[PDB]
């Protein structure tokens, strides 16, 4: 005997992200095993925590990977890239590349800097994250009053930095720059606190290699799908 | 936690074997 | 194997106030917490029990908030506002503003009167609720035979009154005045029982401030949605 | 995952007398109590067991309520109304009025006769139910061989009669007289077995008041809805 | 919350012989009892096991009921009717009439022969079922090699015969004679093995009465509905 | 064995009383 | 016996409160 | 008493996590 | 009371290979037994493990069944048929005929060779499976470095060979030769390792009979339905 | 393992007798 049913309003709708199965066609069909293939990653996060390389520009617009420095005085230095997980820098990077196919982010970020100069060399860099409120620093002095770390160039090749999450909101938008709205936040700067020194027989000039990552605190949530491109 | 986007309390009618893919590990004549 | 179903008559209807869910689209999505935000009110009633201010008129139609009095004899006094939870008075008031997005009301109402006159002053007011049956009183004398309270103006600034629910029906209509039908009921009046006295050096004239509320007995039920306005 | 369903043939039918609910719209809505209103009757039968009044005719077609009698000899008497729960008599009566909004009836009927004559009077009536088989009696003599009761007019004002159910069928049709078909049955007659006597100073003539009812045996089943009227 | 359902292909089909209920309209309606009516047969089989009468022809095509015999020599005798539960004979008979509103049959058949001749008479008949393989016998001699019984006409009026089921197939077709196909099978014959004798004062000639039935072995299955007729 | 042509595992929703035919065997005023 | 014309074995999905009519009998501010 | 206008006896098929909003409180490479 | 249902997108689709029943029409119908019919095979595999006969060609394109040999030197011998379970050879064969109404195959194959020559004869054959990588051998010498077996023609008439499954993939495609793609694999060759010898009075020439089969390792999965033919 | 292409968790509504084919093995007058 038939069960009366009240057909609901929708009735012939197809939902794209609809959490529930549909009907088979080819069953009791066994799949070709795996077994022998190591290297299965279940979560994406566990990805965007592998530095990939932030490309630093020069006139030809030929960005290239190094922050590059010498003998003396900056400037307002060495660099400056903001922390707007959509920047020019971080995009192309995994974290930033992954962070994008997601609507929101939270947690602490990490910037790692590896020196590439001669071993007979020696330098000393100041590094800082300066939160939005006032403006982009325009002098180390102005910078230092922010979360930073004086990097001493020695044996130990690379430094690990990590710019927190100084955020009102428990979360932030992964970046879609219909303008710059209030939410987004960050600038990280870096300048030498003593010049980069070197004896006779060694180079003036030296390049130091850039690599973003998402810490032990990084969280991306709300899948989405960006912005149709077709590169170059 | 659960499969991915797949969350109804009634899970599968058919038979796993039937909805996704098994999954696996490596008469007579007479005289 | 398919379960036979008898499709019911409605079959492609959408009910506005239909008590039952519908289909998702974006799941396993965690919401930004709260945690730190005190001040969550669950019930509305717990609202419409906070006086807000009944505006009393004068020629310019510039109603203003005070019942205002002096030196002597009313009149048929001081005021008179009925108890028709749709009045001119009570509307704009919370209770009256809330009472409206609801079809019915029951329980006892409360009118609170705070005196604003000089401390070197002194007055004495009679107050009353007069149920429908006969007409609107036209003299204190005529009023007194109703539920009332002689208010002695002293130290103690405010008085609390409360006009019951003298109703046949267990409930009353929150007010929609396609005429005045039988259900609605009330007039509250107030006049001085002794004039408002004052020595030398102080004002003749004084204003006393109006504020409606819904007691420990007030009940609104049947949501609805009134009467499209667009103020002024 | 969707449950396959076989849609049945009907599929967009609305059944009038369909035993099953439908969808709400305004819920968690509490009803105005009762409490204080005695006089709730649950069953209809408990109605059609209250005499109401069988109207007896005279030339003007001004039926009126009394069987009316005197000083001597009938006739073929006094009256005669059949028992065809659709008659001219019983219709207008509760039982007969209720019996109609129902397709079938069973059980024993009861006819009650209250005398209205002078207390200084005296009469004696024969009463009978005569089943279909032969014809309508044409003389008391012919009547008596049926279920009857000799009524002695005394102190005790009213008599209670009750015409059984002498029926083949366990049930009978409540009456719809596309002709008189075989099922329906009954005639009840009444005549005086001694005249209605009275001394000097009292009236010749006297009226006795008519009132049908459905016994402790009466059963109506099969709701229906008759015959569109619009009285007079 | 709505349960998703996959509507199956059929979706507005009505099946005639569909094993499942449908929707009511008039409920809680009590049926007029029975109680007092003996003679309720639940199964049909229990019907087609009551001889009814196989009509035997003569020139006028006025079949009539008797196998009829005398004084001496057949012929190729007396009769012959095949066992093709659709014959000319068996149709009109209950069993044969019932056997028809069914697609298949199995089990043993029974032919009963009651003698109607004078009591001062005497006869002796040979009776046989001859299966298909060779042809219809053309002489008793040729017949006898089949399942038979020599009937001795005495006191004991009737004989009971029963032609088995000598069938390859566990079942046979109840008969629809788009030709005679292989399945159907049977001929039953009967001839006198000694003439039918009688003294002086009694009749030459005598008629013996025919009546088919379905044994303690008969089974009809597959309801159907034949062949639109409109008799004579 | 079962009714006649009528064989679903879910038998009757309504109520017998409601699908076929029951089947059977032969306030105050005050004073 | 049961309501009136209303006889399915599955009775009410919604919630009585929701299909017919309940039926009945006669934060801080701080200082 | 219950959510708001939401009253069926069968509550939610999907999974809370799936119909409204969770709600909350504040591999190797190798060497 | 009706259960709300969300009708899913498909809603009037018919799936060919849909794993689930549909509605009956003719029920409580009992099937004609079996009982007495031995020889029921449940699985197909248990079929395609019975040699049937690989047809070997000669100019007329009159393939015929024998590998046929003598007195001396091949050639590049005797034969050569690849192992591409779709070949020219294996098709027509059960295994190959069954293997086809299936998309994939795995396991070891078996080739059985029965000698038909005179008993006074004597020969000695080398046999081999040569996997794809290099090319089809062009000399025994070149062949031998593959899985093989020297067959000594004696008493014991037939030899059993079996070409493994030397496959990357756990499975292989049953063959549909939109070209020869990488997956498919095999050639089996056979040549005499000593000539086929014979005394006086016996034949030069002798034919040896071909019969493919699927081992104790053979597996076909993914039903399908090939390639519309209509023979000759 | 199961019938052939036939795999739903709810198996058969009707009644085997009703969906496929049974399957098998070889009142009074009075006097």
JSON list of N, CA, C and O in Angstrom, two decimals, chain C residues 1-11 15 17-19 103-104 106 170-171 221-224, chain D residues 3-8 10-14 18 20-30 33:
[
{"chain": "C", "resi": 1, "resn": "UNK", "atom": "N", "xyz": [14.49, -1.97, -4.32]},
{"chain": "C", "resi": 1, "resn": "UNK", "atom": "CA", "xyz": [13.14, -1.99, -4.91]},
{"chain": "C", "resi": 1, "resn": "UNK", "atom": "C", "xyz": [12.35, -0.76, -4.45]},
{"chain": "C", "resi": 1, "resn": "UNK", "atom": "O", "xyz": [12.33, -0.43, -3.25]},
{"chain": "C", "resi": 2, "resn": "UNK", "atom": "N", "xyz": [11.69, -0.09, -5.40]},
{"chain": "C", "resi": 2, "resn": "UNK", "atom": "CA", "xyz": [10.90, 1.12, -5.14]},
{"chain": "C", "resi": 2, "resn": "UNK", "atom": "C", "xyz": [9.70, 0.90, -4.22]},
{"chain": "C", "resi": 2, "resn": "UNK", "atom": "O", "xyz": [8.97, -0.13, -4.39]},
{"chain": "C", "resi": 3, "resn": "UNK", "atom": "N", "xyz": [9.52, 1.86, -3.31]},
{"chain": "C", "resi": 3, "resn": "UNK", "atom": "CA", "xyz": [8.38, 1.93, -2.35]},
{"chain": "C", "resi": 3, "resn": "UNK", "atom": "C", "xyz": [7.21, 2.69, -3.02]},
{"chain": "C", "resi": 3, "resn": "UNK", "atom": "O", "xyz": [7.32, 3.88, -3.33]},
{"chain": "C", "resi": 4, "resn": "UNK", "atom": "N", "xyz": [6.00, 2.14, -3.32]},
{"chain": "C", "resi": 4, "resn": "UNK", "atom": "CA", "xyz": [4.97, 2.95, -3.95]},
{"chain": "C", "resi": 4, "resn": "UNK", "atom": "C", "xyz": [4.59, 4.10, -3.05]},
{"chain": "C", "resi": 4, "resn": "UNK", "atom": "O", "xyz": [4.51, 3.89, -1.80]},
{"chain": "C", "resi": 5, "resn": "UNK", "atom": "N", "xyz": [4.36, 5.25, -3.65]},
{"chain": "C", "resi": 5, "resn": "UNK", "atom": "CA", "xyz": [3.94, 6.46, -2.91]},
{"chain": "C", "resi": 5, "resn": "UNK", "atom": "C", "xyz": [2.76, 7.13, -3.59]},
{"chain": "C", "resi": 5, "resn": "UNK", "atom": "O", "xyz": [2.72, 7.25, -4.83]},
{"chain": "C", "resi": 6, "resn": "UNK", "atom": "N", "xyz": [1.85, 7.55, -2.75]},
{"chain": "C", "resi": 6, "resn": "UNK", "atom": "CA", "xyz": [0.65, 8.26, -3.17]},
{"chain": "C", "resi": 6, "resn": "UNK", "atom": "C", "xyz": [0.91, 9.73, -3.09]},
{"chain": "C", "resi": 6, "resn": "UNK", "atom": "O", "xyz": [1.03, 10.28, -1.97]},
{"chain": "C", "resi": 7, "resn": "UNK", "atom": "N", "xyz": [1.00, 10.38, -4.25]},
{"chain": "C", "resi": 7, "resn": "UNK", "atom": "CA", "xyz": [1.23, 11.79, -4.15]},
{"chain": "C", "resi": 7, "resn": "UNK", "atom": "C", "xyz": [-0.03, 12.56, -3.88]},
{"chain": "C", "resi": 7, "resn": "UNK", "atom": "O", "xyz": [-1.03, 12.42, -4.60]},
{"chain": "C", "resi": 8, "resn": "UNK", "atom": "N", "xyz": [0.14, 13.34, -2.83]},
{"chain": "C", "resi": 8, "resn": "UNK", "atom": "CA", "xyz": [-0.89, 14.18, -2.26]},
{"chain": "C", "resi": 8, "resn": "UNK", "atom": "C", "xyz": [-1.09, 15.45, -3.09]},
{"chain": "C", "resi": 8, "resn": "UNK", "atom": "O", "xyz": [-0.11, 15.99, -3.65]},
{"chain": "C", "resi": 9, "resn": "UNK", "atom": "N", "xyz": [-2.27, 15.91, -3.02]},
{"chain": "C", "resi": 9, "resn": "UNK", "atom": "CA", "xyz": [-2.99, 16.95, -3.77]},
{"chain": "C", "resi": 9, "resn": "UNK", "atom": "C", "xyz": [-2.12, 18.21, -3.93]},
{"chain": "C", "resi": 9, "resn": "UNK", "atom": "O", "xyz": [-1.92, 18.71, -5.05]},
{"chain": "C", "resi": 10, "resn": "UNK", "atom": "N", "xyz": [-1.59, 18.73, -2.80]},
{"chain": "C", "resi": 10, "resn": "UNK", "atom": "CA", "xyz": [-0.75, 19.97, -2.81]},
{"chain": "C", "resi": 10, "resn": "UNK", "atom": "C", "xyz": [0.31, 19.89, -3.91]},
{"chain": "C", "resi": 10, "resn": "UNK", "atom": "O", "xyz": [0.22, 20.60, -4.92]},
{"chain": "C", "resi": 11, "resn": "UNK", "atom": "N", "xyz": [1.27, 19.04, -3.64]},
{"chain": "C", "resi": 11, "resn": "UNK", "atom": "CA", "xyz": [2.38, 18.45, -4.40]},
{"chain": "C", "resi": 11, "resn": "UNK", "atom": "C", "xyz": [3.34, 19.56, -4.87]},
{"chain": "C", "resi": 11, "resn": "UNK", "atom": "O", "xyz": [4.57, 19.38, -4.87]},
{"chain": "C", "resi": 15, "resn": "UNK", "atom": "N", "xyz": [4.99, 26.66, 1.49]},
{"chain": "C", "resi": 15, "resn": "UNK", "atom": "CA", "xyz": [4.39, 27.27, 2.66]},
{"chain": "C", "resi": 15, "resn": "UNK", "atom": "C", "xyz": [5.45, 28.17, 3.31]},
{"chain": "C", "resi": 15, "resn": "UNK", "atom": "O", "xyz": [6.58, 27.74, 3.55]},
{"chain": "C", "resi": 17, "resn": "UNK", "atom": "N", "xyz": [5.39, 29.82, 6.40]},
{"chain": "C", "resi": 17, "resn": "UNK", "atom": "CA", "xyz": [5.64, 29.57, 7.83]},
{"chain": "C", "resi": 17, "resn": "UNK", "atom": "C", "xyz": [5.79, 28.05, 8.13]},
{"chain": "C", "resi": 17, "resn": "UNK", "atom": "O", "xyz": [5.66, 27.62, 9.29]},
{"chain": "C", "resi": 18, "resn": "UNK", "atom": "N", "xyz": [6.15, 27.26, 7.03]},
{"chain": "C", "resi": 18, "resn": "UNK", "atom": "CA", "xyz": [6.18, 25.78, 7.09]},
{"chain": "C", "resi": 18, "resn": "UNK", "atom": "C", "xyz": [7.24, 25.31, 8.08]},
{"chain": "C", "resi": 18, "resn": "UNK", "atom": "O", "xyz": [8.42, 25.14, 7.72]},
{"chain": "C", "resi": 19, "resn": "UNK", "atom": "N", "xyz": [6.80, 24.81, 9.19]},
{"chain": "C", "resi": 19, "resn": "UNK", "atom": "CA", "xyz": [7.64, 24.13, 10.17]},
{"chain": "C", "resi": 19, "resn": "UNK", "atom": "C", "xyz": [8.23, 22.77, 9.70]},
{"chain": "C", "resi": 19, "resn": "UNK", "atom": "O", "xyz": [7.61, 21.69, 10.02]},
{"chain": "C", "resi": 103, "resn": "UNK", "atom": "N", "xyz": [-0.73, 39.18, 17.26]},
{"chain": "C", "resi": 103, "resn": "UNK", "atom": "CA", "xyz": [-2.21, 39.27, 17.09]},
{"chain": "C", "resi": 103, "resn": "UNK", "atom": "C", "xyz": [-3.03, 39.46, 18.40]},
{"chain": "C", "resi": 103, "resn": "UNK", "atom": "O", "xyz": [-4.03, 40.19, 18.43]},
{"chain": "C", "resi": 104, "resn": "UNK", "atom": "N", "xyz": [-2.62, 38.80, 19.49]},
{"chain": "C", "resi": 104, "resn": "UNK", "atom": "CA", "xyz": [-3.37, 38.86, 20.80]},
{"chain": "C", "resi": 104, "resn": "UNK", "atom": "C", "xyz": [-2.48, 39.21, 22.01]},
{"chain": "C", "resi": 104, "resn": "UNK", "atom": "O", "xyz": [-1.27, 39.02, 21.98]},
{"chain": "C", "resi": 106, "resn": "UNK", "atom": "N", "xyz": [-2.78, 39.44, 26.63]},
{"chain": "C", "resi": 106, "resn": "UNK", "atom": "CA", "xyz": [-3.40, 39.13, 27.93]},
{"chain": "C", "resi": 106, "resn": "UNK", "atom": "C", "xyz": [-2.44, 39.48, 29.04]},
{"chain": "C", "resi": 106, "resn": "UNK", "atom": "O", "xyz": [-1.22, 39.54, 28.83]},
{"chain": "C", "resi": 170, "resn": "UNK", "atom": "N", "xyz": [-10.47, 35.49, 27.49]},
{"chain": "C", "resi": 170, "resn": "UNK", "atom": "CA", "xyz": [-9.17, 35.23, 28.19]},
{"chain": "C", "resi": 170, "resn": "UNK", "atom": "C", "xyz": [-8.05, 36.08, 27.57]},
{"chain": "C", "resi": 170, "resn": "UNK", "atom": "O", "xyz": [-6.98, 36.30, 28.18]},
{"chain": "C", "resi": 171, "resn": "UNK", "atom": "N", "xyz": [-8.34, 36.52, 26.35]},
{"chain": "C", "resi": 171, "resn": "UNK", "atom": "CA", "xyz": [-7.41, 37.31, 25.54]},
{"chain": "C", "resi": 171, "resn": "UNK", "atom": "C", "xyz": [-8.13, 38.45, 24.82]},
{"chain": "C", "resi": 171, "resn": "UNK", "atom": "O", "xyz": [-9.36, 38.47, 24.71]},
{"chain": "C", "resi": 221, "resn": "UNK", "atom": "N", "xyz": [0.57, 36.68, 21.81]},
{"chain": "C", "resi": 221, "resn": "UNK", "atom": "CA", "xyz": [0.68, 35.40, 21.02]},
{"chain": "C", "resi": 221, "resn": "UNK", "atom": "C", "xyz": [-0.11, 35.47, 19.68]},
{"chain": "C", "resi": 221, "resn": "UNK", "atom": "O", "xyz": [-1.20, 36.05, 19.60]},
{"chain": "C", "resi": 222, "resn": "UNK", "atom": "N", "xyz": [0.50, 34.85, 18.65]},
{"chain": "C", "resi": 222, "resn": "UNK", "atom": "CA", "xyz": [-0.02, 34.78, 17.25]},
{"chain": "C", "resi": 222, "resn": "UNK", "atom": "C", "xyz": [0.88, 35.62, 16.32]},
{"chain": "C", "resi": 222, "resn": "UNK", "atom": "O", "xyz": [0.40, 36.34, 15.43]},
{"chain": "C", "resi": 223, "resn": "UNK", "atom": "N", "xyz": [2.18, 35.10, 16.14]},
{"chain": "C", "resi": 223, "resn": "UNK", "atom": "CA", "xyz": [2.76, 36.18, 15.30]},
{"chain": "C", "resi": 223, "resn": "UNK", "atom": "C", "xyz": [2.06, 36.48, 14.00]},
{"chain": "C", "resi": 223, "resn": "UNK", "atom": "O", "xyz": [1.43, 35.55, 13.39]},
{"chain": "C", "resi": 224, "resn": "UNK", "atom": "N", "xyz": [2.24, 37.77, 13.68]},
{"chain": "C", "resi": 224, "resn": "UNK", "atom": "CA", "xyz": [1.72, 38.42, 12.49]},
{"chain": "C", "resi": 224, "resn": "UNK", "atom": "C", "xyz": [2.76, 39.48, 12.03]},
{"chain": "C", "resi": 224, "resn": "UNK", "atom": "O", "xyz": [3.96, 39.34, 12.30]},
{"chain": "D", "resi": 3, "resn": "UNK", "atom": "N", "xyz": [15.92, 7.38, -1.86]},
{"chain": "D", "resi": 3, "resn": "UNK", "atom": "CA", "xyz": [15.15, 6.10, -1.80]},
{"chain": "D", "resi": 3, "resn": "UNK", "atom": "C", "xyz": [14.30, 5.98, -3.08]},
{"chain": "D", "resi": 3, "resn": "UNK", "atom": "O", "xyz": [13.40, 6.79, -3.34]},
{"chain": "D", "resi": 4, "resn": "UNK", "atom": "N", "xyz": [14.46, 5.01, -4.03]},
{"chain": "D", "resi": 4, "resn": "UNK", "atom": "CA", "xyz": [13.60, 4.98, -5.21]},
{"chain": "D", "resi": 4, "resn": "UNK", "atom": "C", "xyz": [12.16, 4.80, -4.79]},
{"chain": "D", "resi": 4, "resn": "UNK", "atom": "O", "xyz": [11.89, 4.01, -3.84]},
{"chain": "D", "resi": 5, "resn": "UNK", "atom": "N", "xyz": [11.27, 5.50, -5.48]},
{"chain": "D", "resi": 5, "resn": "UNK", "atom": "CA", "xyz": [9.82, 5.40, -5.22]},
{"chain": "D", "resi": 5, "resn": "UNK", "atom": "C", "xyz": [9.05, 5.23, -6.52]},
{"chain": "D", "resi": 5, "resn": "UNK", "atom": "O", "xyz": [9.35, 5.88, -7.53]},
{"chain": "D", "resi": 6, "resn": "UNK", "atom": "N", "xyz": [8.08, 4.34, -6.43]},
{"chain": "D", "resi": 6, "resn": "UNK", "atom": "CA", "xyz": [7.19, 4.05, -7.54]},
{"chain": "D", "resi": 6, "resn": "UNK", "atom": "C", "xyz": [5.96, 4.89, -7.41]},
{"chain": "D", "resi": 6, "resn": "UNK", "atom": "O", "xyz": [5.15, 4.67, -6.48]},
{"chain": "D", "resi": 7, "resn": "UNK", "atom": "N", "xyz": [5.82, 5.86, -8.31]},
{"chain": "D", "resi": 7, "resn": "UNK", "atom": "CA", "xyz": [4.63, 6.65, -8.18]},
{"chain": "D", "resi": 7, "resn": "UNK", "atom": "C", "xyz": [3.43, 5.99, -8.78]},
{"chain": "D", "resi": 7, "resn": "UNK", "atom": "O", "xyz": [3.44, 5.57, -9.95]},
{"chain": "D", "resi": 8, "resn": "UNK", "atom": "N", "xyz": [2.45, 5.94, -7.89]},
{"chain": "D", "resi": 8, "resn": "UNK", "atom": "CA", "xyz": [1.17, 5.32, -8.12]},
{"chain": "D", "resi": 8, "resn": "UNK", "atom": "C", "xyz": [0.26, 6.21, -8.98]},
{"chain": "D", "resi": 8, "resn": "UNK", "atom": "O", "xyz": [0.31, 7.45, -8.86]},
{"chain": "D", "resi": 10, "resn": "UNK", "atom": "N", "xyz": [-2.88, 7.27, -9.26]},
{"chain": "D", "resi": 10, "resn": "UNK", "atom": "CA", "xyz": [-3.67, 8.47, -8.83]},
{"chain": "D", "resi": 10, "resn": "UNK", "atom": "C", "xyz": [-2.86, 9.74, -9.05]},
{"chain": "D", "resi": 10, "resn": "UNK", "atom": "O", "xyz": [-3.18, 10.54, -9.94]},
{"chain": "D", "resi": 11, "resn": "UNK", "atom": "N", "xyz": [-1.88, 9.89, -8.20]},
{"chain": "D", "resi": 11, "resn": "UNK", "atom": "CA", "xyz": [-0.72, 10.79, -8.09]},
{"chain": "D", "resi": 11, "resn": "UNK", "atom": "C", "xyz": [-1.20, 12.24, -7.94]},
{"chain": "D", "resi": 11, "resn": "UNK", "atom": "O", "xyz": [-0.62, 13.04, -7.19]},
{"chain": "D", "resi": 12, "resn": "UNK", "atom": "N", "xyz": [-2.35, 12.82, -8.54]},
{"chain": "D", "resi": 12, "resn": "UNK", "atom": "CA", "xyz": [-2.54, 14.21, -8.09]},
{"chain": "D", "resi": 12, "resn": "UNK", "atom": "C", "xyz": [-3.98, 14.42, -7.61]},
{"chain": "D", "resi": 12, "resn": "UNK", "atom": "O", "xyz": [-4.53, 15.52, -7.70]},
{"chain": "D", "resi": 13, "resn": "UNK", "atom": "N", "xyz": [-4.52, 13.34, -7.07]},
{"chain": "D", "resi": 13, "resn": "UNK", "atom": "CA", "xyz": [-5.92, 13.29, -6.60]},
{"chain": "D", "resi": 13, "resn": "UNK", "atom": "C", "xyz": [-6.11, 13.83, -5.18]},
{"chain": "D", "resi": 13, "resn": "UNK", "atom": "O", "xyz": [-5.26, 13.65, -4.30]},
{"chain": "D", "resi": 14, "resn": "UNK", "atom": "N", "xyz": [-7.24, 14.49, -5.08]},
{"chain": "D", "resi": 14, "resn": "UNK", "atom": "CA", "xyz": [-7.78, 15.00, -3.81]},
{"chain": "D", "resi": 14, "resn": "UNK", "atom": "C", "xyz": [-9.06, 14.25, -3.45]},
{"chain": "D", "resi": 14, "resn": "UNK", "atom": "O", "xyz": [-10.07, 14.34, -4.15]},
{"chain": "D", "resi": 18, "resn": "UNK", "atom": "N", "xyz": [-10.95, 11.85, 2.71]},
{"chain": "D", "resi": 18, "resn": "UNK", "atom": "CA", "xyz": [-9.67, 11.14, 2.87]},
{"chain": "D", "resi": 18, "resn": "UNK", "atom": "C", "xyz": [-9.22, 11.16, 4.32]},
{"chain": "D", "resi": 18, "resn": "UNK", "atom": "O", "xyz": [-8.54, 12.11, 4.77]},
{"chain": "D", "resi": 20, "resn": "UNK", "atom": "N", "xyz": [-6.72, 11.26, 6.35]},
{"chain": "D", "resi": 20, "resn": "UNK", "atom": "CA", "xyz": [-5.34, 11.57, 6.75]},
{"chain": "D", "resi": 20, "resn": "UNK", "atom": "C", "xyz": [-5.11, 13.09, 6.63]},
{"chain": "D", "resi": 20, "resn": "UNK", "atom": "O", "xyz": [-5.63, 13.74, 5.70]},
{"chain": "D", "resi": 21, "resn": "UNK", "atom": "N", "xyz": [-4.32, 13.60, 7.55]},
{"chain": "D", "resi": 21, "resn": "UNK", "atom": "CA", "xyz": [-3.96, 15.00, 7.79]},
{"chain": "D", "resi": 21, "resn": "UNK", "atom": "C", "xyz": [-3.44, 15.64, 6.50]},
{"chain": "D", "resi": 21, "resn": "UNK", "atom": "O", "xyz": [-3.48, 15.04, 5.42]},
{"chain": "D", "resi": 22, "resn": "UNK", "atom": "N", "xyz": [-2.91, 16.86, 6.71]},
{"chain": "D", "resi": 22, "resn": "UNK", "atom": "CA", "xyz": [-2.26, 17.67, 5.66]},
{"chain": "D", "resi": 22, "resn": "UNK", "atom": "C", "xyz": [-1.28, 18.62, 6.37]},
{"chain": "D", "resi": 22, "resn": "UNK", "atom": "O", "xyz": [-1.04, 18.50, 7.58]},
{"chain": "D", "resi": 23, "resn": "UNK", "atom": "N", "xyz": [-0.71, 19.57, 5.65]},
{"chain": "D", "resi": 23, "resn": "UNK", "atom": "CA", "xyz": [0.34, 20.43, 6.26]},
{"chain": "D", "resi": 23, "resn": "UNK", "atom": "C", "xyz": [-0.21, 21.69, 6.96]},
{"chain": "D", "resi": 23, "resn": "UNK", "atom": "O", "xyz": [-1.13, 22.36, 6.46]},
{"chain": "D", "resi": 24, "resn": "UNK", "atom": "N", "xyz": [0.39, 21.98, 8.14]},
{"chain": "D", "resi": 24, "resn": "UNK", "atom": "CA", "xyz": [0.07, 23.15, 8.98]},
{"chain": "D", "resi": 24, "resn": "UNK", "atom": "C", "xyz": [0.44, 24.46, 8.28]},
{"chain": "D", "resi": 24, "resn": "UNK", "atom": "O", "xyz": [0.44, 24.50, 7.01]},
{"chain": "D", "resi": 25, "resn": "UNK", "atom": "N", "xyz": [0.72, 25.50, 9.10]},
{"chain": "D", "resi": 25, "resn": "UNK", "atom": "CA", "xyz": [1.22, 26.84, 8.62]},
{"chain": "D", "resi": 25, "resn": "UNK", "atom": "C", "xyz": [1.52, 27.80, 9.83]},
{"chain": "D", "resi": 25, "resn": "UNK", "atom": "O", "xyz": [2.55, 28.48, 9.85]},
{"chain": "D", "resi": 26, "resn": "UNK", "atom": "N", "xyz": [0.60, 27.80, 10.79]},
{"chain": "D", "resi": 26, "resn": "UNK", "atom": "CA", "xyz": [0.68, 28.59, 12.07]},
{"chain": "D", "resi": 26, "resn": "UNK", "atom": "C", "xyz": [0.78, 27.56, 13.24]},
{"chain": "D", "resi": 26, "resn": "UNK", "atom": "O", "xyz": [-0.23, 27.00, 13.68]},
{"chain": "D", "resi": 27, "resn": "UNK", "atom": "N", "xyz": [1.99, 27.29, 13.77]},
{"chain": "D", "resi": 27, "resn": "UNK", "atom": "CA", "xyz": [2.18, 26.23, 14.84]},
{"chain": "D", "resi": 27, "resn": "UNK", "atom": "C", "xyz": [2.50, 26.82, 16.25]},
{"chain": "D", "resi": 27, "resn": "UNK", "atom": "O", "xyz": [2.56, 28.04, 16.43]},
{"chain": "D", "resi": 28, "resn": "UNK", "atom": "N", "xyz": [2.71, 25.90, 17.21]},
{"chain": "D", "resi": 28, "resn": "UNK", "atom": "CA", "xyz": [3.04, 26.23, 18.63]},
{"chain": "D", "resi": 28, "resn": "UNK", "atom": "C", "xyz": [2.08, 27.32, 19.17]},
{"chain": "D", "resi": 28, "resn": "UNK", "atom": "O", "xyz": [2.41, 28.07, 20.09]},
{"chain": "D", "resi": 29, "resn": "UNK", "atom": "N", "xyz": [0.90, 27.33, 18.55]},
{"chain": "D", "resi": 29, "resn": "UNK", "atom": "CA", "xyz": [-0.18, 28.31, 18.84]},
{"chain": "D", "resi": 29, "resn": "UNK", "atom": "C", "xyz": [-1.22, 27.74, 19.81]},
{"chain": "D", "resi": 29, "resn": "UNK", "atom": "O", "xyz": [-2.04, 26.88, 19.45]},
{"chain": "D", "resi": 30, "resn": "UNK", "atom": "N", "xyz": [-1.31, 28.20, 20.85]},
{"chain": "D", "resi": 30, "resn": "UNK", "atom": "CA", "xyz": [-2.17, 27.75, 21.96]},
{"chain": "D", "resi": 30, "resn": "UNK", "atom": "C", "xyz": [-3.57, 28.32, 21.81]},
{"chain": "D", "resi": 30, "resn": "UNK", "atom": "O", "xyz": [-3.75, 29.52, 21.55]},
{"chain": "D", "resi": 33, "resn": "UNK", "atom": "N", "xyz": [-8.75, 28.59, 26.11]},
{"chain": "D", "resi": 33, "resn": "UNK", "atom": "CA", "xyz": [-9.40, 27.54, 26.76]},
{"chain": "D", "resi": 33, "resn": "UNK", "atom": "C", "xyz": [-10.85, 27.71, 26.78]},
{"chain": "D", "resi": 33, "resn": "UNK", "atom": "O", "xyz": [-11.34, 28.84, 26.43]}
]
